[PDB]
C-alpha cells in the first residue's frame, strides 16, 4: 500500500559507487544531478509513510512519523534501501562516522542515511518511541532542535578538518519542528570561529543564514507558501535553490502566493546554458504544468520581484553555479548576469 | 567565542572628532550586528546605533549628523566616529554583539549580549 | 521616541527578600523588552530577553514577565552579589531606548 519510488533507491546506490573514491577537495561540491538525488531520496522517504497512525499520534503535532524507529522501521522506502543490493549500502555506511569522512560517496551517504534512519551524529535517536505521544512540549522541542543542529553542525565539523567550501546537504523542513533559525544560526556560529572562514562551508553559511532572518511563518507578511506533506512554509524574499533544495521542497508542490508580485519559478535546465522558468501573478495556487524533470536537469528555484535582500534573487546566486568553485554565497560576490540564456515557458 | 576590546584616545578637544575602535575576536563582523552604547559618569545608558552584517548602519536621530560607523573586514573590525563633540559625550563608550531574531513575527528582536569591557573619553580643553 | 521609565529609583532590601522592579513604555511594545543587570565596575549583563525569556546560565531567582507598556523583573530571593542597577531597554521601534535604571541595594 505504501509508496515506494524504488528509482532513486537505484540512483542514490549507483550515486555513491561513482562518488566513493573521489576526494573532497578545497571547492568540491555535490553536483545538480545527486543534489536531485539527494532530495528526491527524502523526499520519498517521507511519501512512504506520511501521517502518523491515528492510535500513536503526537498531541504537539510533531511528525513522529519521520523521527522515530516506530515508524522508519517499518517505513517500506527504508527498509527497502537498507536491504538494496545485499545491503551493500549499510555494510558501507555501518564504517562512516563525522570524524573519518574523506570522500564524496562517505560524505553523501552517511549524511543522508543518518536522515533516513533517525539517527544523531552520535547514534542517539531523534525522538525515543516513547515520546511519540509525549506532551512535553520544551523537551521534545529540544530533542528536535537538537537534531536538526546537529546536521548542519556535523557538517561543518567535516568542512572544517577537510578546508571544503561547498559541500551542503540541508536539513529537511519538518526537522525544523518549533525549531528558532535565528537561534540555529547564533548557536552554531558563537561556538566555533573556524566556522566563519570565507573559504569553509559557504552553501551551509548561505542555507543558515537565509534562515535566521526569514521565519518560517511570516503570518500577514508571507508572500509565498510551500507545502508538501503536510510540512508547510513560508517566504517573502526570492527562494534560492539552497533554500528548497536544503529544506526538500519542491516547484511541484504546493506553492500558494498571498500577493500580485511577479514569481519566476525555474524548474529545468536548457540547451544554452540557461533556465527554463515558469511566471506567476495572480494570487492563489501556482501549479507549474510542465513535465518533472530527470535528475540532470530538474531545478527548484523562485526569484521573487517585488516593488513596495533584493541579491536572493540575482541569477547566479538563487540558482547554484555548476561550476563549484564559482558558486556564490554572499550578497558581496553576487552577479544578475546571463539572462539572456533563460527562458520563459508560458 | 565573541568577544569584543574597546580602544580610542582617551582625550578629545571640544568640536573635534571622536575616534574608536572596536576589535572582534571568536567570529567575523560579517556574521552577526553589531551596536555601540555609551553611558555618562553616574547616568544611564545610550545607544548610539547599530551595524548590520552587510555593513549597513542606522543610527540614533538624536546624533544622527554626528555619527559615522563602518566595518573593516580585513581587520575584523568596526568603528565610530563623532564628530562635533561636547562635554555631552564625555562617556564611558562600549560596543556590544546584537544578537537578532526573525522567528516571531517579521519584526526584529535585538539584543546585546556581548558587550566590551568600555573606553572612557572625556571631552575637554 | 519610545520612552521608558522604571520605579522604584533604587531601593533595599535583606538577603532572601523578594524584590520586584516595574518598567514602564509610553506606548505599545509588545514583549519587546530585555533586561540587563550592571554591577558596579562592569558592563551591563543581559539577564532577560522578550520581556519573560531567561538567556542562558542566568540563575532561576531572576524571572521577568509583561507584555504592552507595563513590565516587571522579579528576584525571587534576593543575593548578595546581586547588588547592581537594573535597567530596561526596548527594541520595538528605532532607536532602542533604556530605562533610567533602579539601583538594587543589600540591606544588611
Known amino acids: 500500500v505504501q509508496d515506494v519510488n524504488v528509482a532513486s533507491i537505484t540512483a542514490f546506490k549507483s550515486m555513491i559507487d561513482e562518488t566513493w573514491d573521489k576526494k573532497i577537495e578545497a571547492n568540491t561540491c555535490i553536483s545538480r544531478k545527486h543534489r536531485n538525488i539527494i532530495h528526491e531520496v527524502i523526499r520519498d522517504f517521507m511519501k512512504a509513510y506520511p501521517k502518523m497512525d491515528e492510535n500513536k499520534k503526537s498531541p504537539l503535532g510533531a511528525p513522529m512519523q519521520w523521527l522515530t524507529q516506530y515508524y522508519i522501521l517499518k517505513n517500506e522506502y527504508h527498509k527497502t534501501m537498507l536491504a538494496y543490493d545485499n545491503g551493500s549500502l549499510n555494510t558501507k555506511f555501518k564504517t562512516l562516522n563525522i570524524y573519518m569522512i574523506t570522500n564524496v560517496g562517505q560524505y553523501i551517504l552517511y549524511i543522508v542515511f543518518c536522515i533516513i534512519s533517525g539517527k544523531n551524529h552520535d547514534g542517539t535517536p531523534y525522538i525515543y518511541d516513547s515520546e511519540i505521544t509525549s506532551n512535553d512540549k520544551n523537551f521534545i522541542n529540544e530533542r528536535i532542535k537538537y537534531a536538526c543542529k546537529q546536521i548542519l553542525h556535523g557538517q561543518l565539523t567535516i568542512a572544517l578538518r577537510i578546508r571544503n567550501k561547498f559541500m551542503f546537504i540541508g536539513s529537511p523542513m519538518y526537522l525544523w519542528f518549533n525549531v528558532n533559525g535565528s537561534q540555529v544560526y547564533h548557536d552554531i556560529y558563537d561556538r566555533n570561529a573556524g566556522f566563519h572562514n570565507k573559504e569553509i562551508g559557504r552553501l551551509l553559511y548561505a542555507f543558515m543564514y537565509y534562515l535566521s532572518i526569514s521565519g518560517r511563518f511570516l503570518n500577514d507578511f508571507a508572500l509565498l507558501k510551500f507545502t508538501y506533506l503536510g510540512e508547510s512554509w513560508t517566504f517573502s524574499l526570492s527562494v534560492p535553490e539552497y533554500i528548497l533544495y536544503g529544506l526538500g521542497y519542491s516547484v511541484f508542490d504546493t506553492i500558494e502566493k498571498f500577493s500580485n508580485d511577479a514569481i519566476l519559478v525555474y524548474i529545468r535546465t536548457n540547451n544554452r546554458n540557461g533556465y527554463d522558468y515558469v511566471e506567476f501573478n495572480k494570487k492563489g495556487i501556482a501549479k507549474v504544468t510542465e513535465d518533472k524533470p530527470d535528475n540532470d536537469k530538474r531545478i527548484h528555484a523562485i526569484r521573487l520581484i517585488n516593488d513596495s535582500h533584493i541579491h536572493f534573487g540575482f541569477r547566479n546566486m538563487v540558482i547554484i553555479d555548476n561550476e563549484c568553485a564559482n558558486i556564490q554565497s554572499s550578497a558581496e560576490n553576487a552577479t544578475d548576469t546571463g539572462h539572456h540564456q533563460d527562458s520563459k515557458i508560458n | 567565542q565573541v568577544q569584543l576590546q574597546e580602544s580610542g584616545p582617551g582625550l578629545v578637544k571640544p568640536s573635534e572628532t571622536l575616534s574608536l575602535t572596536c576589535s572582534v575576536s571568536g567570529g567575523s563582523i560579517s556574521t552577526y550586528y553589531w551596536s555601540w552604547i555609551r553611558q555618562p559618569a553616574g547616568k544611564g545608558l545610550e545607544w548610539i546605533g547599530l551595524?548590520?552584517?552587510?555593513?549597513?548602519?542606522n543610527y540614533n536621530p538624536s546624533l544622527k549628523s554626528r555619527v559615522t560607523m563602518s566595518g573593516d573586514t580585513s581587520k575584523n573590525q568596526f568603528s565610530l566616529k563623532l564628530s562635533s563633540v561636547t562635554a555631552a559625550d564625555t562617556a564611558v563608550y562600549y560596543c556590544?554583539?546584537?544578537?537578532?531574531?526573525?522567528?516571531?513575527?517579521?519584526?526584529?528582536?535585538?539584543?546585546?549580549?556581548?558587550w566590551g569591557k568600555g573606553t572612557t573619553v572625556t571631552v575637554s580643553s | 521616541d519610545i520612552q521608558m521609565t522604571q520605579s522604584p529609583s533604587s531601593l533595599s532590601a535583606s538577603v532572601g527578600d523578594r524584590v520586584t522592579i516595574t518598567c514602564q513604555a509610553s506606548?505599545?511594545?509588545?514583549?519587546?523588552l530585555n533586561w540587563y543587570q550592571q554591577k558596579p565596575g562592569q558592563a551591563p549583563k543581559l539577564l532577560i530577553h522578550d520581556a519573560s525569556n531567561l538567556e542562558t546560565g542566568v540563575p532561576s531567582r531572576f524571572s521577568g514577565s509583561g507584555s504592552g507598556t507595563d513590565f516587571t523583573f522579579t528576584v525571587s530571593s534576593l543575593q548578595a552579589e546581586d547588588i547592581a542597577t537594573y535597567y530596561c531597554?526596548?527594541?520595538?521601534?528605532?532607536?532602542?531606548?533604556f530605562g533610567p535604571g533602579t539601583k538594587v541595594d543589600i540591606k544588611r
Open positions: 506606548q505599545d511594545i509588545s514583549n519587546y
Open positions: 551595524m548590520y552584517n552587510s555593513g549597513s548602519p
Open positions: 531597554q526596548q527594541y520595538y521601534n528605532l532607536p532602542f531606548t
Open positions: 556590544a554583539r546584537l544578537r537578532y531574531d526573525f522567528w516571531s513575527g517579521s519584526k526584529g528582536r535585538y539584543y546585546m549580549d556581548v
